Amino acid sequence: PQITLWKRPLVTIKIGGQLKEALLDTGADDTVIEEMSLPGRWKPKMIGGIGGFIKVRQYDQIIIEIAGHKAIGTVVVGPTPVNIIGRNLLTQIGATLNF
């Protein structure tokens, strides 16, 4: 698809069998998801946004569908104001920025 940016580029994702809404975010290195349960072990990570840092739980090789495209990669979980799909999984679904 071709997505214009007059509105937020929100898409449906599926993770852990659950449907969620997420922002396709070229300004995010990482994929950041609201508090939820994921399988396996996690390791710690500090991510920094506009208003400082938050601690998150990093899970690798998580299976997630994004706007209908399968990805498998790292997802970090923590107190984000919105689910964010960052460049690590945008590259997996073949997304580009064009103008």
Ligand X SMILES: COc1ccc(S(=O)(=O)N(CC(C)C)C[C@@H](O)[C@H](Cc2ccccc2)NC(=O)O[C@H]2CO[C@H]3O[C@@H]4OCC[C@@H]4[C@H]32)cc1
Positions touching a copy of itself (CB under 8 A) are: 1-6, 8-9, 23-29, 32, 47-54, 67, 69, 80-82, 84, 87, 90-91, 93-99
In the complex, what is the shortest distance from the CB of residue 59 to Na ion, in angstroms, rounded to a whole number? 5
- The owner of tokens 């799909």 is 85
Q: Say how far apart CA 72 and CA 38 lie, in whole Å.
A: 13
Q: Say how far apart CA 65 and CA 43 lie, in whole Å.
A: 22
Which one of 34, 45, 57, 73 is in contact with Cl ion (CB under 5 A)?
A: 73
Q: Say how far apart CA 81 and CA 56 lie, in whole Å.
A: 13
Using the rule CB under 5 A, is 40 a contact of Na ion? yes
In the complex, what is the shortest distance from the CB of residue 57 to ligand X, in angstroms, rounded to a whole number? 14
Interface with ligand X by CB under 6 A: which residues? 25, 27-30, 32, 47-50, 81-82, 84, 86
CB 83 within 8 A of CB 21: yes
In the complex, what is the shortest distance from the CB of residue 30 to Cl ion, in angstroms, rounded to a whole number? 8
What Rg do the C-alpha atoms of the chain give, in angstroms? 13
Catalytic residues: 25
